[PDB]
Amino acid sequence: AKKVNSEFLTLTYGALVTQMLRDFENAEDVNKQLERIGYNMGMRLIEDFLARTSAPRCLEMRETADRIQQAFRIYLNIQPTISNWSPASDEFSLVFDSNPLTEFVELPPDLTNLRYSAILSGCIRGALEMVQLEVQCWFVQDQLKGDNVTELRVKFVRRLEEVIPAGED
Amino acid sequence: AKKVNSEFLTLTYGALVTQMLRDFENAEDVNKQLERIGYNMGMRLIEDFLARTSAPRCLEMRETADRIQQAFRIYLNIQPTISNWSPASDEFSLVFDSNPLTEFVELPPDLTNLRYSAILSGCIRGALEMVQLEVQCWFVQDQLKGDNVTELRVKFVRRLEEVIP
Amino acid sequence: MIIYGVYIVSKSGGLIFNLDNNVPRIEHEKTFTYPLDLVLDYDSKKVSVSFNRKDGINVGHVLVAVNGMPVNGVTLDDGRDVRTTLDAPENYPINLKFSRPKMTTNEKIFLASMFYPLFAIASQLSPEPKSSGIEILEADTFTLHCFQTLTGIKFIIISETGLNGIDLLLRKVYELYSDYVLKNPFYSLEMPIRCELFDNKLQELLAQVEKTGISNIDK
Amino acid sequence: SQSIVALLFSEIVQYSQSRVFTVPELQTRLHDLGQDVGTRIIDLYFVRERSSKRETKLTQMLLFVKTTVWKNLFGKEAEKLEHANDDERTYYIIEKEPLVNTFISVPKDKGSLNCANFTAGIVEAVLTNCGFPCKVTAHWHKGTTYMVKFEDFVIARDKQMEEK
Amino acid sequence: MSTYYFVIVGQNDNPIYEKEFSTVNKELRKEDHRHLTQFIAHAALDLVDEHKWKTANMQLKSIDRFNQWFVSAFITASQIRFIIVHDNKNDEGIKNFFNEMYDTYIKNSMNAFYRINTPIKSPMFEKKSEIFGRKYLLS
Amino acid sequence: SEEILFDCLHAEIVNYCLDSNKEHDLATLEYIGFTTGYRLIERLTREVSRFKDELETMKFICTDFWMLIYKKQVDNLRTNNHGMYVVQDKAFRFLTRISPGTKQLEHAPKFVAFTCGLVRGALSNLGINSTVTAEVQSIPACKFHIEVNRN
Amino acid sequence: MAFCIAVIGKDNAPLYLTTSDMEQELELQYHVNAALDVVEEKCLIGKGAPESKELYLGLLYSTENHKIYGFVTNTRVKFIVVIDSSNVALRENEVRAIFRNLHLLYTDAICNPFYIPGESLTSKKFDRAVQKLMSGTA
Amino acid sequence: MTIFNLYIFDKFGTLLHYAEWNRTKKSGITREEEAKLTYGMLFSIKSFVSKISPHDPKEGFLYYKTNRYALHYLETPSGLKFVLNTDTTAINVKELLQQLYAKVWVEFVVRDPLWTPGTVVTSELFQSKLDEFVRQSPIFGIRNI
């Protein structure tokens, strides 16, 4: 029954963001720790995303893109769209349509340096850590910032696994 | 006709002991070298015996006696009466009414100390160090020495265990 | 039928969670006589038998308590040595009480520590290419199922030889692992599991797996 | 989903544990966050469930909150709402389902209180904004219960209204 | 015409946010009238306390009088007080007009940045106030 | 079967490699062994006549012995222009235990010596009159030429 | 009644025992019997007796109340006994059996490697088996 | 049942013999260090199964199976070790490896005078016999139990 309301989680997250900003005036630290907790969630979250689909780690990067894409539909019940691949064809752009945590939560223009929902941008980080595929991942257009629809840019950097599943570590 | 395939070992071994004798006069040489060659022999046959029987191993003494009497039964076709059991039961006596290694060589080998079962010792000894049994062997009674019936006495000491793999 | 020991290990391999099912180790009793057929060979505070196995006694099987006197190391609780009573024939016949040495917690920790690189280095240069480490081991009396979550976590549960569909049990323990690690980020990703909630829900899982049928996946 | 909320809330709790050096005012942080969420939970759930209708009767408003907040937050409305006759300021709302243990929780050896306090703070904010300021304490009595302590002023206004 | 003027009285009784809906005139005197109407917000606060204890509904039509002004009071589940001072009443529409500003204030509520009696600063709510006032009251 | 005992025991026969004699075994093993084989021969298809002589070719006793012992008869059995002759086998039983590479020839003649110097008979081709040497050109292909001790 | 059990190699008398149904031959017939046996064996060998088949020869010689049987092994070994009579109750199938057993004991002693071929049958164990054969026939 | 490869190690722990028919991935490290790594593999496995088993290990370890191949083991009471390796689908190969041991290795190693225990087994005859014996019923696969 989805056992949650988008509003409910939105309230919890907004209150938490309020809490950090009340803790540290500088948005730099709130961004740091929010990406830290995004990493933290993304490590355990993949343990459930792989509890349903037993996809092989990475045959190709488009497989990773579709995996992370379906992840949000599993959790946040939104379908992102993958596009804008390089001639190198390793990176990509990913579109989040509607963000439950965002829904009518305005941000102070005196707080612009904050990356509000970057937890997801870090969750995939924490996710991509686990499968031994670290990634330079972040946003190029933010529906939060005033852009039309959310758009995160994924630059994969390097692998951590050999012909054995154990891989380098 | 031609039932008994094997009366040629009682004379092959006879040739062995005679030529060892003619090489070294000492009565105990033809015992100890004969024992070590029968020891290599036992190494070579225990492998095939476990190949057929598929016994797990001689983790116990009574089962070891059973395996050894089975080995004698299959190749040397004699029934070792397992008797004379120690209170600690670490040792048992093998009663061979008829020597299988020989068939009537003769009662006097012209002189004593001529241990006629050294291969038999190897036969019982070698397999043990291959089935990982650091065991001592010795003969308590030999019918060939002017006696009624041959009894052997074999005493396990240490469970041979593999080390530093 | 039961899942003997449900365990799990970190990337380093330290046994995270020694979930022991109820496992009655066999206890043997015998009133022995004058010095023994049993190989009362002393080996590093473990007064056990290596050779001369009788009456369902194994190599591990070690004396626990003669006439209900538990052994401390090698000595009697009253302070006499085992062999001190062994040489004494007046008390004979005397009741020996043998049990296989039950793997304590630190023992199982060391066992998992020594095991881990085995699976980790499991024929790294195996004849077949692109292969994995050991996925299933099957032994004389048990079968171990190890399941790597493609990185990090290794669910290692040992079940009966004839048991089937253990992969689904691994799936459910994966689920309950997530349901636990929900709560404590201060629970480090390599700290041992100490939580009674996981314990009781896995006791429910054990009660279920008393019944073979796993459906709507049974928990 | 459930894993996302359960985890993410867990990081609220433990990040507070980071900024907090002891049990009790850690629990106070949990209470404060429960307040900061209930402070809008209240008037969201007002319109969509109470049909935008106010309940001056403490019993009726409290019962309706008991149904609504639990029905939408955690699905199952709390089992029982009781009023203690010895102390009309102090009533109980027992919820056998632990909302902390929905995400099965920490050993309560190093600590005592949990997300129970967070939902208690939610209840307290709902009460104090409904015009019934109160103290809501999570208690491990008969499992999870929330003891509610009404201000003598508020319960006095109630008693005066309970003079028909 | 009515010199409609809206004011917020918070949970902790401190005023929050105003919004004129009157014709343009007498603005220097309207500053003193704004002080006056904040005082009237307190007086409303006081009276509407017991008057809302009299009832259980959202709207309390009009309570206080000052020989030219009418005071219309709106109480919420948020126990906020939304007050209009106005020479001649327009209550029939403002019941649901208060309902709509209620819904917008809820929108601000989901913005966790806006908090308990935390004074209004968002342009969104200001432009909502402008469009709504030009709709019914300022018209 | 009762083959592995003799196989190993003969391996040790080889094993003692004392630096005195190319015959690790003397013809005594021969004599006693085919004396037992003669115990097997209580019947032989040779006439009873005291006034007439009938010859039992050593070739035939050799092949029957071999079936009783080596279990594969001659492949080539050639009668030399003398009273002597030669036997050739593509394979030998003791040699089935080793590859056909010519590495240690000298063992196999000691193996087959068991048919050398056998307690003879009077008439030519009478069953047991045996003086013979081993001349093996190929590892499984064992060859043995006999020489008449007399003449 | 007396039997003389004799094995014969190429030229000598390896083992001759002169026994009777009661005991060894007390009569001083030793040398005469040995000489007669050797002469008979030599003449018969010169005639043809050397042959492949195990050669049966009953009454191939006939002394004073002692009738001789010769037997031939393809291994060139001979065997002799006599019966102390021109006529006494006995058989010849028994002769076949007893010299078959005599061959059996011969080869079983040949098993003894200390016994080099062509020697006196020294072992009192073997010789008591031989005189047990004697008891079997007398 | 056609297989990937077979390993034969003495109780001491040396490489008595290796055989290959299907091993596809050709390693970079030497097959000697590979043999020693497999022997440590096996002995530590034996320890693991001996000690973590709740009941008496009669013959101890049996085999392991992976995602893509599988490995099977044979402990002689002599202490000799056989190990085979292949893909998945076949009859259980415990009796297969036992038949190979009794019918070939016993037949064409132990019975050889040239064969001296404590050394390697180098003989084209045994290589043949082993090859055609695996090629006796040589379809594929294991699924050993």
Residue numbers in the entry:
A (entry chain G): 10 to 178
B (entry chain A): 10 to 174
C (entry chain D): 1 to 219
D (entry chain F): 31 to 194
E (entry chain E): 1 to 139
F (entry chain B): 2 to 152
G (entry chain H): 1 to 138
H (entry chain C): 1 to 145
Provide the authors' own sentences about this structure as they appear in the paper.
The TRAPP complexes are nucleotide exchange factors that play essential roles in membrane traffic and autophagy. TRAPPII activates Rab11, and TRAPPIII activates Rab1, with the two complexes sharing a core of small subunits that affect nucleotide exchange but being distinguished by specific large subunits that are essential for activity in vivo. We report a cryo‐EM structure of the entire Drosophila TRAPPIII complex. The TRAPPIII‐specific subunits TRAPPC8 and TRAPPC11 hold the catalytic core like a pair of tongs, with TRAPPC12 and TRAPPC13 positioned at the joint between them.
To assign the eight small subunits within the core, we used the crystal structures that have been obtained for several of these subunits from mammals, either singly or in subcomplexes comprising up to four subunits. These were used to model the seven Drosophila core subunits which were then built into the density map. The subunits could be readily fitted into the map with the assembly of all seven, with TRAPPC3 being present twice, creating an octamer that forms the central flattened rod (and EV3). As expected, TRAPPC1 and TRAPPC4, which form the catalytic site to activate Rab1, are at the centre of the rod, flanked on either side by a TRAPPC3 subunit (C3a and C3b). TRAPPC1 and TRAPPC4 share a longin domain fold, with TRAPPC4 also having a PDZ‐like domain that protrudes from one side. The absence of this domain in TRAPPC1 leaves a groove on the other side of the rod, which is partially occupied by the C‐terminal region of one of the two TRAPPC3 subunits (C3b). TRAPPC1, TRAPPC5 and TRAPPC2 are known to be related to TRAPPC4, TRAPPC6 and TRAPPC2L, respectively, and so the octamer has an approximate two‐fold rotational symmetry, suggesting that it evolved by gene duplications adding, or altering, one half. TRAPPC5 contains a disordered N‐terminal region and an extra C‐terminal α‐helix that is not present in TRAPPC6.
